[PDB]
């Protein structure tokens, strides 16, 4: 509610830190065809924009002439755009990992040259002898790993959009 | 400080939620020997203890009859014990993941039933000629990823214990 607008800036700041954390966790160079939620570097600038728009609400929370509320509305519009962008991005990336990918989304050099040999989207060995092979127990683990990361990110994107929608009045 | 202690319960609640999320992410069946941070099932009861010691702080912020402050003490001390236990487990698990694990910690059956064979500590083939294999680019990548998750969990645990030690005064 608006009466407790003080305790939504700590929330926004922690949310920005959590976006920073998920971005840092995504930068790990595991394969050449990297997820689309990393090569676009969304979580970094999204978290930093949340952190500015939160820290600015944090320590003023009062009625000033123009900058305060004008910034507050442009930042809230920016945040809602960022939220719908993250929604669309997650709903495309879940499909990218659980259903055959369609967009290559080429990646950066400094991270390709480390692990340029492996595929993750469809790593099923051709010869049936490798059905009980490390490369597929490994692939099933890594698929579960993206599923867990993306499900937590999904849950938190809905929580942010929920409390934003509950504080836009 | 006390001047704004009424907005620390939200920090406690969110930090408990972060502990729950990291525990859920560690639940994934990655290898035969799961880390000690998940075999002891710490993060679950840790997050629940955090959430409960939170949702009592932000109740009324007044001097209740007897229930709020006596429990704010007993529940506070128990959370201190939990925090120092988490410290000890983390300083054990860093050595476990970056030095050869001296203790077993056999994982549970309903999860290993999918990937029961791979090891996460020593992915070194006997013959050095085979060292140019996918299963070790993979194991080094997983080791760096576990290192990153545990490092961010260490960071956030020091942050939560610092804010606690600051406010519980």
């Amino acid at each position, epitope marked *: 509610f608006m009466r407790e607008s003080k305790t939504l800036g700590a929330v926004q700041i922690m949310n920005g830190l959590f976006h920073i954390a998920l971005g840092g966790l995504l930068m790990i160079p595991a394969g050449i065809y990297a997820p689309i939620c990393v090569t676009v570097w969304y979580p970094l600038w999204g978290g930093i924009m949340y952190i500015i728009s939160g820290s600015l609400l944090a320590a003023t929370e009062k009625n000033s002439r123009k900058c305060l509320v004008k910034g507050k509305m442009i930042m809230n519009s920016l945040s809602l755009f960022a939220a719908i962008s993250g929604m669309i991005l997650s709903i495309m990336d879940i499909l990218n990992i659980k259903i055959s990918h369609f967009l290559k989304m080429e990646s950066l050099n400094f991270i390709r040259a480390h692990t340029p040999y492996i595929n993750i989207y469809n790593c099923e060995p*051709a*010869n*049936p*002898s*490798e*059905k*009980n*092979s*490390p*490369s597929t127990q490994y692939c099933y683990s890594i698929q579960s790993l993206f599923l867990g990361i993306l499900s937590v990110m999904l849950i938190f994107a809905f929580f942010q959009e929920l409390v934003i929608a509950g504080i836009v009045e | 400080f006390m001047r704004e202690s009424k907005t620390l319960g939200a920090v406690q609640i969110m930090n408990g939620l972060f502990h729950i999320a990291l525990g859920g992410l560690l639940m994934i069946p990655a290898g035969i020997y799961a880390p000690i941070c998940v075999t002891v099932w710490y993060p679950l009861w840790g997050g629940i203890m955090y959430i409960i010691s939170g949702s009592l702080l932000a109740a009324t912020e007044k001097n209740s009859r007897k229930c709020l402050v006596k429990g704010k003490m007993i529940m506070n001390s128990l959370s201190l014990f939990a925090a120092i236990s988490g410290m000890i487990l983390s300083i054990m698990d860093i050595l476990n993941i970056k030095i050869s694990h001296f203790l077993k910690m056999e994982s549970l059956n309903f999860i290993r039933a999918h990937t029961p*064979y791979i090891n996460i500590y020593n992915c070194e083939p*006997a013959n050095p*000629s*085979e060292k140019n*294999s*996918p*299963s070790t680019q993979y194991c080094y990548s997983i080791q760096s990823l576990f290192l990153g998750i545990l490092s961010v969990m260490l960071i956030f645990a020091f942050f939560q214990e610092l804010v606690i030690a600051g406010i519980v005064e």
Partner: antibody, heavy 118, light 113 residues
Framework: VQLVQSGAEVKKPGSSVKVSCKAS????????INWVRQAPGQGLEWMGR????????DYNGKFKGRVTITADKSTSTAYMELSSLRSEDTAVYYC????????????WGQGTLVTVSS | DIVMTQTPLSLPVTPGEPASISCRSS???????????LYWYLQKPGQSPQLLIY???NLVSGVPDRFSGSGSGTDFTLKISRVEAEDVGVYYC?????????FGGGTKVEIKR
């Protein structure tokens, strides 16, 4: 690495043999186990395979499931059984360990020649 | 079943100059991954088979470098840079793209005199 196979046995049609393809020097449970025979006048023909870890199998299909494959984890010994022997089953039977990641079948046993005759 | 056919079944070779043996597949082995999976086995007289050429383009540790292989996807050639008097035996090609695995009929290489 060593793979030591059972000795040679001469039998009669309708009998059965149990060959022990015992090996040491590696993780037996971390490798596949296959049996392959070599009959005179024919090339090499795959008859089946076993995964000792959990009992997974693959069959060629030409031999309609008549073979029984088992595993003994207590001694890391695999066994091959051949019933209803026919003259066309005379061959040398080899066991072989699958090595993952490209090097399919580097180490092979010495083989056991089984001759079926009345 | 997929049938493997070799040509020729036997080839007397003379030291030095010639080296020629071919395999072909009836289904045009290709997994759309850019690599064609193959194996070459050698059975020396009186002992167990050994692998000479793995994935058709790489050699194993310890085998003399005088061995090579190439192809397009349906027609294949195994080349020996310098044939000697010790690489006797039956050479087998094989495919592992799909179950069931199949093996060639064998080519007996001998010395020409």
């Amino acid at each position: 690495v060593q793979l030591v196979q059972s000795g040679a046995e001469v039998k009669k049609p309708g009998s059965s043999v149990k060959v022990s393809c015992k090996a040491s020097g590696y993780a037996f449970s971390y490798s596949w186990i296959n049996w392959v025979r070599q009959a005179p006048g024919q090339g090499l023909e795959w008859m089946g395979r076993i995964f000792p870890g959990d009992g997974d199998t693959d069959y060629n299909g030409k031999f309609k499931g008549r073979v029984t494959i088992t595993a003994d984890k207590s001694t890391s010994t695999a066994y091959m059984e051949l019933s209803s022997l026919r003259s066309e089953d005379t061959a040398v039977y080899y066991c072989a360990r699958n090595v993952f990641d490209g090097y399919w079948l580097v180490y092979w046993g010495q083989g056991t020649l089984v001759t079926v005759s009345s | 079943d997929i049938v493997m056919t070799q040509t020729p079944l036997s080839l007397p070779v003379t030291p030095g100059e010639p080296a020629s043996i071919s395999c072909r597949s009836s289904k045009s082995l290709l997994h759309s991954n850019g690599i064609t999976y193959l194996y070459w086995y050698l059975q020396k007289p009186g002992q167990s088979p050994q692998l000479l050429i793995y994935q058709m383009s790489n050699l194993v540790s310890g085998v003399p470098d005088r061995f090579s292989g190439s192809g397009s996807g349906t027609d294949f050639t195994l080349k020996i840079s310098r044939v000697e008097a010790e690489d006797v035996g039956v050479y087998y090609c094989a495919q592992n793209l799909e179950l069931p695995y199949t093996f060639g009929g064998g080519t007996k290489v001998e010395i020409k005199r």
